[PDB]
Amino acid sequence: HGFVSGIVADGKYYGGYLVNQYPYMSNPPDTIAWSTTATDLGFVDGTGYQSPDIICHRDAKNGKLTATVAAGSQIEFQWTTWPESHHGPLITYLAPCNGDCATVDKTTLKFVKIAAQGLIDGSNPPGVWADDEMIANNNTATVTIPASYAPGNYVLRHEIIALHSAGNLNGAQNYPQCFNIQITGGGSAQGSGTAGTSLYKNTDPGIKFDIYSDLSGGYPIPGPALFN
Ligand SMILES: *[C@@H]1O[C@H](CO)[C@@H](O)[C@H](O)[C@H]1NC(C)=O
Ligand SMILES: [Cu+2]
Numbered sequence: 001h002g003f004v005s006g007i008v009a010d011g012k013y014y015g016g017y018l019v020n021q022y023p024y025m026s027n028p029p030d031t032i033a034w035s036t037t038a039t040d041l042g043f044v045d046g047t048g049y050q051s052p053d054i055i056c057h058r059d060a061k062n063g064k065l066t067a068t069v070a071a072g073s074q075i076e077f078q079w080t081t082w083p084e085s086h087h088g089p090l091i092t093y094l095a096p097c098n099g100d101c102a103t104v105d106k107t108t109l110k111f112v113k114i115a116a117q118g119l120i121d122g123s124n125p126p127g128v129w130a131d132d133e134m135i136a137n138n139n140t141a142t143v144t145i146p147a148s149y150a151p152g153n154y155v156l157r158h159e160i161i162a163l164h165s166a167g168n169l170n171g172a173q174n175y176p177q178c179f180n181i182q183i184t185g186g187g188s189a190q191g192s193g194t195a196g197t198s199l200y201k202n203t204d205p206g207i208k209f210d211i212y213s214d215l216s217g218g219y220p221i222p223g224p225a226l227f228n
Contacts, residue, residue: 001040001041001042001043001083001086002041002079002080002081002082002083002139002160002175003016003017003019003020003038003041003079003080003175003177004016004017004033004077004078004079004080004158004177004179005018005078005079005080006078007032007033007067007075007076007077007078007179008074008075008076008078009067009068009069009073009075009181010067010068010069010070010073012067014031014032014033014065014067014179015029015031015033016031016032016033016078016177016179017031017033017034017035017036017063017177019036019038019039019041020039020041022035023035023036023037023039024039030063030064030065031063031064031065032063032065032066032067032179032180032181033063033177033178033179034056034057034060034061034062034063034155034177034178034179034180035060035061035063036056036057036058036059036060036061037058037059038057038058041080042173043162043173043174043175044057044058044173044174044175044176045170045171045172045173045174046169046170046171046172046200046201046202046207047170047202049174049197049199049200049201049202050197051197052106052107052196052197054174054176054196054197054199054200055106055107055109055157055176055178055196055197056106056155056157056176056177056178056196057175057176057177057178060106060178062101062102062103062104062106062180063101063102063178063179063180064102065102065180066100066101066102066153066180066181066182067179067180067181067182068181068182068184069145069181069182069183069184070145070183070184070185070186071145071146071147071148071149071151071183071184071185071186071187072144072145072146072147072185072186073144073145074142074143074144074145075142075143075144075145075156075181076140076141076142077140077141077142077143077158077177078138078139078140079134079139079140079141079160080139081139082131082134082135082139082160084132084135085162085164086131086160086162086163086164086173087126087127087129087131087132087162087163087164087211088118088129088130088131088160088161088162088163088164088166088172088211089116089117089118089119089129089130089131089160089161089163089206089219089221089222090115090116090117090130090131090134090141090158090159090160091113091115091116091158091159091161091221091222091223092113092114092115092116092141092143092156092157092158092159093111093112093113093114093156093157093158093159093193093223094111094112094114094145094149094154094155094156094157094191095109095110095111095112095154095155095157095193095196096109096110096152096153096154096190096193097109097152097153097154097155097180098152098153099153100153101153101154101155101180101181102180104155106155106196107196107197109155109193109195109196110192110193110194110195111155111157111193111194111195111196111199111224112190112191112192112193112194112224112227113191113223113224113225113226113227114143114145114146114149114191114226114227115143115144115226116221116223116226117130117133117221118130118206118219118220118221119215119218119219120132120133122215122216122218122219123215125211125212125213125214125215126164126211126212127211127215127219129163131160131162134160141158143158145181145183146186146189146227147186147187148186148187148188148189149183149186149187149189149190150183150186150187150188150189150190151182151183151184151185151186152182152183153180153181153182154180154181154182154183155178155179155180155181156178156179156180156181157176157177157178157196158176158177158178158179159174159175159176159177160174160175161173161174161175161206161207161222162175163209163211164211166207166208166209166210166211167208167209167210167211167212169202169208170202171208172202172207172208172209174200191227193224194223194224199222199223199224200222200223204222205220205222206219206220206221206222207222
C-alpha cells in the first residue's frame with residue numbers, strides 16, 4: 001500500500017496527487033499527477049485488468065499541469081514508505097497524448113514500456129526485487145527518458161506490481177501512478193503502444209507468479225516489450 005507523493009524532472013520537484021488529502025477537499029491543488037479515488041492507498045488486481053481503473057488507478061482523472069523533461073534525462077519517483085512484504089517489479093511507460101494531456105481521454109492512451117526492473121537476486125526466496133532496491137533508496141525509483149524519444153506531450157505511467165499474494169489468481173496487486181510530462185529535445189523515435197486495458201492478463205506468468213519457491217527459473221517481467 002502506498003502512492004507517489006512527488007517526482008523530480010529536469011531537477012525540479014513536482015508535488016503529486018496526495019491521495020490521503022486531496023480527495024477530502026472540494027478544491028485541491030493543481031498537480032501534474034492524475035487524481036484517483038484510491039484513498040485506502042490500495043491497488044488494482046487482476047479482476048480489474050480490463051477495467052479503466054488499470055490505466056491510471058481508480059477513477060483516475062487527468063492532472064491539470066504538465067512537467068517539462070529533457071529527453072535523455074532522469075525522473076525520480078518518491079513513493080510513500082513501501083512495505084517489505086510487497087516484493088515485485090517496477091515498470092514505467094509513456095503514452096502519447098497527441099494533444100494536451102490535461103484533456104486526453106485516458107481510454108485511448110497506448111503505453112510503451114520504457115523501463116522495467118524485476119527480480120534482482122533470487123538466490124534465496126522470496127528474493128530481492130526492484131521494489132527492495134527502491135525501499136533502500138529512500139523509497140525512490142528512477143528512470144531515464146530515452147534520449148531518442150520524440151518531443152511531445154505524454155502520460156508517464158509508473159507502477160509497482162506487488163507479488164506477495166500472486167500465486168492466487170488475481171492476487172498480484174498493481175499500483176499505477178500517472179503524471180503529465182512534456183518531453184523536450186530528443187529525436188524522432190517512439191514505440192508502438194498497448195492500451196492500458198491490454199497491458200496484463202491474470203494468467204501472464206509474471207502475474208500468476210510464486211515468489212516463495214525456487215527462483216531458478218527467474219522472473220518474466222509482464223507487460224509489452226521494452227523499448228530500445
Ligand atoms: C527522501 O524522500 C522524501 C520524500 O519521501 C524527500 O522529501 C527527502 O528529501 C528524501 N531524502 C533525500 C536524502 O533525498
Ligand atoms: Cu499493500
